[PDB]
Design a binder for these strands. Structure first.
Ligand code: ZN
Ligand code: ZN
Lengths: 619, 442, 173
DNA sequence: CACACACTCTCCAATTCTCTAA
DNA sequence: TTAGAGAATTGGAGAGTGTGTTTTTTTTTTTT
């Protein structure tokens, strides 16, 4: 009987606790009006989730003693609260159906302890701690009901798990043969379980100390909700269990291993027609192209055409070998704005990636095969170019990638695939990634006596695959320096209003790009076709002088990509002469910056081969 | 319904389920005892159809009702029943992998007819059931003793004082790809396909029709289109009376400026044909166009990583940037082109590997522009032994013609706008049908 | 029946034997021997043959096998499978609600103040409130090993029907 | 080695067989 | 005729016995 039940050696009455929690559910209307948690139990009826999250601050404000009993004795109290919630969910809404009994999930919003100060006095208390997940194990199947069958006579029985053990039948009731009941593993019933290793956050550490870690266990319906690298305030019971000295011996070490029996996660670092009509109205705004290009990278100064090219890359061409991915190269001295621009723009798009061209990159450009450490089996770890299969890949310090990386990147940029024949695996992974690059000069400074390919020492076989190449060196003008200094002073005086304006611009920019990807598919108009043919023929007519080649058809395909991207920027859905002229302008400016021989200006052969005519005529 | 690998929770145990995944490793095929036939050692009765589960289980009572024996049994391997057995490691396919997360791996088990149909790297749909598999090392039995971080269950007689853990395994009853000889051709060819290949064989000027259909994006270069088409059809390989081969595959090289359509030819060929490979002259791996020798830390022992020509064995290898090989590949290319083999002899491996491959090379002349005053030998850096390997050399030079430039631009633009004589599937079927013929010489 | 472990109306070896008897027409000779008065010494043997012919069957089911019984039994099999599955699902949900929604090692212990243990102190309960909701004082116990001379008798047969064609032939017989 | 499987061996007692009274 | 007390046979609980339990040097190929 409920009224006779009392927590063991505790004098807390279970029925009183249940009724007090029901009173909390009934009366708590005031988080700052129906009760908040009865509103949530109205929502759960249609949402269908099997849990009710509740705030321990709310419980404490309603009743100090109930909160204290929850914190002190969660192992008994939380099942009591579950029974209370499942009674209320059929007192109200009595005709409802739900596949599982509701699980209450108490939590304090902030940490009650930090993991360095956990003590044995905290054992079996409800606590919550802040941390970062280091590793997350495979889904462990944990038994909850053992199904036994008689080997002789096929009689079956079911027995509950007591405290992890099984009360094996020892004799079959329907034929009385001893030791004849056999556990049928796949007829038994299992719940989900997973181990999570949690490290304290870096700011919480003492000065120069290595991290402490704690083990978490998350069970059914709360199992796979966290990933490595994320941050969480995790609420659970601080358990202490014995560990056996040897797997074949039941002696246990005197020192108990501890872990967190997880009850609630709260991720702390992860974060419509109105949106559609706002974006549609914004697409008709005058100079929307310049508006979006200026919204790109507010911290960076004056680089208009670079931002415009990055915008056209982020919008991309029309998908349908018909590669629509626009390739962009940034080129300039170390310490300049290109690295900051890459580190900004990679998080501005879904499916994006950022990596270094050097061997210290966390995720390499090439796919490889490794032994997964937690299980020591082979796993095909694909590279960043493959993980960014429909997004931008930001390759910083592009220039100094080794020859194998150069070859596989050439393969990716030309074929939009990455072939691997490593360890018996033979497969051709898709990589429709938009390569955005940042390349330094080989020496410490840019050399105006030399063109881009000779300064950066990259092959023409890679440089000719890029749609646009831009120079990020700064002028030596005192007006430029003074304007840059005023801009940097404004960045120093950046305040909350500028931050909110920049974040509003960032949000609408992300939404605009995603919507344009989702719905816009530009297609050629007749004037677009005539303009593109005219552009290619005109830029080929320059070759009448000196008998040189001044263009090649991949330039035309690049212009098609850029025009389609510009049409997608303004949500036209049909590409026409306005887009084609902007594509021509930006493309010609990129060639003017990149393909300029110092002796004669722009010359197209610099991209086709290294060593332009003014250099090669030494021999 | 197809489930993701992430959705294989314990609630899915025992249910029919379909998943998609990429195979990573395939283990050897073994015989698995499905049901033992046992002999009772102290009354000589045979017991048939003893089902097994996971630990090898002999029967626990004698079939002879009055017999007291419960341990002394002997397996009859000859009258027992076995099934073919393989386990394969898969992982999440590329489409299913969540962002910024390690790929999740799963052990699939294949039985009977499915025991080698899936190989590593293949993207395959598996149908079957998620099962739970015990830690069989922990279980002692009358048949065999035990063989000895999480807690696990307790309390079973067979388990003793140990604790039993569990792991999830997908018992696949079927496997298929996620997206898909003379006897085989004769069986596969349906009546429409027979009529189509017959009409193509009787098609007058099938030469130009196939050239146009296979290379519609290419402007001009009819001779090069014809040569590459003949490369696809190929010659008859032969074996001398002394067991020495005569090459049947031809090899074609296309030299041209970087501004011309030499890469377009290779891309069209590799898009069209099955089993073909595209590669640069420079290697994107330790192995290049030919094999290389690498240690693996699983044994700290040398093995051979295969190159592009071996992957293109019995096929076509398109090699762009042919002029810029490494010395190892450039030397081994001599054997591969003519002898159609690669003979590696290094520490821990001796192997004559097969490269029965037709090569479509694309080359850049020195100084970019093809100089007509210079000979082709002076234009390219390929050595005379290499140049003798090729059956055909073709030259693509970027003329400054206004009409040609307008035609190229028009072809690109109107083809790009069009996308929304023969289809490539028809050409594939006719080519596979035609390659079974072995013309004699009159 | 380890090898003849055969389902509701799959033809057993006995069914095939009876069908062979029917096709050979020896059933007509048995009927002639039973109906004829000239050779009544074989009547006892023919009674034995008939008694061995009918072993799985019972007359109430056998007499009702009309020509249209196959379609009826198809629908009956589907209905029986449906009710069996629904019954099993209901039993599963009763077991699921009996145990809690927390995992097995989710601890916590209670005292029932008004209930004496086998000693003088109150009982301490460990299996959770949901097991206390319908408490029984034999939850953790095992059954007793009753000795061989004390065990009850059990049925020597279970009612697998013979194949429907054999049932029609046996009804006609 | 000291703590667990597997087997043998011993005597206690649990249940039935047989004789007697109600 | 039906039910309880004394004697006989066999199940099995328990005691005893036997057995089982990263880090350095040297090489080789390939990467620059
Ligand atoms: Zn049984
Ligand atoms: Zn026996």
């Amino acid at each position: 009987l409920g009224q006779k039940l009392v927590i063991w050696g505790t004098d807390v009455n279970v029925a009183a606790c249940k009724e007090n929690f029901q009173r909390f559910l009934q009366r708590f209307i005031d988080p700052l009006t129906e009760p908040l948690y009865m509103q949530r139990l109205g929502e759960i009826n249609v949402i269908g989730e099997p849990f009710l999250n509740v705030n321990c601050e709310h419980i404490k404000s309603f009743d100090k003693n109930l909160y204290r009993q929850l914190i002190s004795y969660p192992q008994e109290v939380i099942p009591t609260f579950d029974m209370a919630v499942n009674e209320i969910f059929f007192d109200r809404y009595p005709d409802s159906i739900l596949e599982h009994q509701i699980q209450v999930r108490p939590f304090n919003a902030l940490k009650t302890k930090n993991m360095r100060n956990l003590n044995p006095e905290d054992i079996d208390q409800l606590i919550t701690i802040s941390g970062m997940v280091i590793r997350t194990s495979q889904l462990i199947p944990e038994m909850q009901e053992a199904f036994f069958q008689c080997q002789v006579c096929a009689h079956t029985t079911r027995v509950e798990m007591d405290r992890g053990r099984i009360a094996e039948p020892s004799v079959c009731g329907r034929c009385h043969t001893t030791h004849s009941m056999a556990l049928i593993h796949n007829r038994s019933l299992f719940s989900d379980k997973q181990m999570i290793k949690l490290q304290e956050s870096p700011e919480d550490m003492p000065a120069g100390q290595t991290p402490h870690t704690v083990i978490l266990f998350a069970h059914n319906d709360l199992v796979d909700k966290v990933q490595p690298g994320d941050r969480v305030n995790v609420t659970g019971i601080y358990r202490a269990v014995p560990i056996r000295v040897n797997p074949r011996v039941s002696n246990v070490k005197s020192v108990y291993k501890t872990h967190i029996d997880v009850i609630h996660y709260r991720k702390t670092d992860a974060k419509s027609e109105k949106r559609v009509e706002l974006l549609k109205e914004l697409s008709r705004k005058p100079d929307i192209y310049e508006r979006l290009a200026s919204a790109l990278a507010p911290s960076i100064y004056e680089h208009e055409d670079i931002k415009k090219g990055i915008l056209l890359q982020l919008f991309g061409g029309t998908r349908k070998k018909f590669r629509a991915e626009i390739n962009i190269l940034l080129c300039g001295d170390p310490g300049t704005s290109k690295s900051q621009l890459l580190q900004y723009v990679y998080n501005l798009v879904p499916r994006g990636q950022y990596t270094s061209g050097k061997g210290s990159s966390a995720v390499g450009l090439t796919a490889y095969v490794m032994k997964d450490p937690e299980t020591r089996q082979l796993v095909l770890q694909t590279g960043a170019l493959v993980l960014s299969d429909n997004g931008i890949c930001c390759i910083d310090e592009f220039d100094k990638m080794n020859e194998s990386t150069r070859s596989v990147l050439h393969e990716v940029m030309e074929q939009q695939t990455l072939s691997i024949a490593k360890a018996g695996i033979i497969c051709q992974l898709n990589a429709r990634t938009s390569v955005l690059a940042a390349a330094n000069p080989i020496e410490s400074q840019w050399n105006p006596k030399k063109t881009t390919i000779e300064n950066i020492q990259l092959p023409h076989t890679l440089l000719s695959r890029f749609d646009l190449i831009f120079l990020l060196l700064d002028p030596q003008d005192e007006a430029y320096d003074r304007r840059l200094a005023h801009h940097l002073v404004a960045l120093y005086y950046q305040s909350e209003e500028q931050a909110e304006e920049e974040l509003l611009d960032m949000a609408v920019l992300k939404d605009y790009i995603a919507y344009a990807h989702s719905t816009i598919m530009p297609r050629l108009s007749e004037e677009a076709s005539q303009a593109l043919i005219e552009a290619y023929v005109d830029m080929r007519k320059i070759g009448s002088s000196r008998g040189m080649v001044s263009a090649y058809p991949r330039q035309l395909e690049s212009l098609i990509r850029l025009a389609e991207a510009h049409a997608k920027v303004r949500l036209s859905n049909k590409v026409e002469a306005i887009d084609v002229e902007e594509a021509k302008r930006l493309h010609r400016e990129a060639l003017k910056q990149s393909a300029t021989d110092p002796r004669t200006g722009i010359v197209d052969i610099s991209i086709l081969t290294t060593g332009m005519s003014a250099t090669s005529r030494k021999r | 319904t197809r489930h993701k690998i992430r959705e294989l929770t314990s609630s899915r145990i025992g249910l029919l389920t379909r998943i998609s995944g990429q195979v990573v490793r395939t283990h050897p095929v073994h015989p698995e005892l499905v049901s033992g036939t046992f002999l009772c050692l102290d009354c000589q009765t045979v017991i048939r159809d003893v089902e097994q589960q996971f630990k090898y289980t002999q029967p626990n009572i004698c079939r002879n009702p009055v017999c007291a024996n419960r341990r002394r049994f002997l397996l009859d391997t000859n009258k027992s029943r076995f099934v073919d057995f393989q386990k394969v490691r898969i992982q999440e396919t590329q489409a299913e992998l969540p962002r910024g997360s390690i790929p999740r791996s799963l052990e699939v088990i294949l039985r009977a007819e499915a025991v080698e149909s899936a190989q590593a790297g293949d993207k395959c749909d598996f149908t079957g059931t998620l099962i739970v598999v015990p830690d069989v090392s922990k279980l002692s039995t009358p048949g065999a003793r035990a063989e000895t971080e999480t807690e696990g269950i307790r309390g079973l007689r067979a388990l003793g004082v140990r604790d039993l853990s569990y792991r999830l395994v997908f018992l696949a009853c079927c496997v298929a790809p996620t997206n898909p000889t003379a006897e085989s051709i004769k069986n596969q060819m349906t009546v429409k396909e027979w009529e189509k290949v017959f009409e193509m064989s009787q098609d007058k000027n099938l030469y130009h029709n196939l050239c146009t259909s296979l290379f519609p994006t290419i402007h001009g270069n009819d001779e090069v289109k014809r040569g590459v088409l003949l490369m696809l059809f190929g010659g008859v390989p032969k074996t001398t009376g002394e067991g020495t081969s005569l090459r049947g595959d031809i090899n074609v090289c296309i030299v041209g400026d970087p501004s011309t359509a030499k890469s377009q030819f290779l891309k069209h060929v590799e898009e069209f044909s099955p089993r073909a490979v595209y590669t640069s002259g420079k290697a994107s791996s330790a192995a290049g166009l030919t094999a290389a020798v690498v240690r693996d830390e699983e044994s700290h022992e040398f093995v051979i990583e295969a190159g592009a020509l071996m992957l293109a064995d019995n096929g076509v290898c398109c090699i762009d940037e042919f002029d810029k090989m490494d010395v190892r590949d450039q030397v081994a290319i001599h054997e591969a082109m003519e002898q159609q083999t690669i003979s590696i002899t290094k520490a821990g491996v001796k192997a004559t590997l097969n490269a029965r491959t037709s090569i479509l090379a694309a080359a850049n002349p020195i100084s970019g522009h093809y100089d007509r005053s210079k000979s082709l030998k002076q234009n390219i850096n390929l050595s005379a032994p290499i140049m003798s390997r090729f059956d055909l050399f073709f030259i693509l030079v970027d003329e400054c013609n206004e009409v040609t430039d307008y035609a190229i631009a028009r072809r690109i633009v109107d083809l790009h706008s069009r996308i929304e004589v023969y289809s490539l599937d028809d050409i594939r079927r006719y080519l596979l049908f035609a390659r079974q013929f072995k013309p004699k010489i009159s | 029946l380890d090898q003849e472990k055969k389902i509701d109306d799959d033809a057993s070896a006995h069914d095939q034997l009876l069908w062979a008897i029917h096709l050979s027409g020896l059933d007509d000779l048995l009927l002639f021997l039973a109906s004829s008065s000239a050779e009544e010494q074989w009547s006892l043997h023919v009674l034995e043959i008939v008694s061995l012919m009918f072993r799985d069957q019972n007359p109430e089911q056998l007499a009702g096998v009309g020509q249209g019984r196959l379609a009826q039994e198809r629908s009956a099999d589907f209905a029986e499978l449906e009710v069996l599955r629904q019954r099993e699902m209901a039993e599963k949900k009763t077991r699921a609600l009996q145990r809690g929604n927390r995992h097995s090692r989710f601890g916590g212990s209670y005292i029932v103040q008004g209930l004496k243990s086998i000693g003088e102190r109150d009982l301490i309960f460990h299996k959770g409130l949901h097991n206390l909701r319908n408490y029984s004082s034999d939850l953790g116990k095992q059954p007793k090993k009753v000795p061989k001379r004390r065990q009850a008798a059990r049925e020597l047969s279970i009612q697998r029907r013979s194949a429907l064609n054999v049932r029609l032939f046996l009804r006609d017989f």
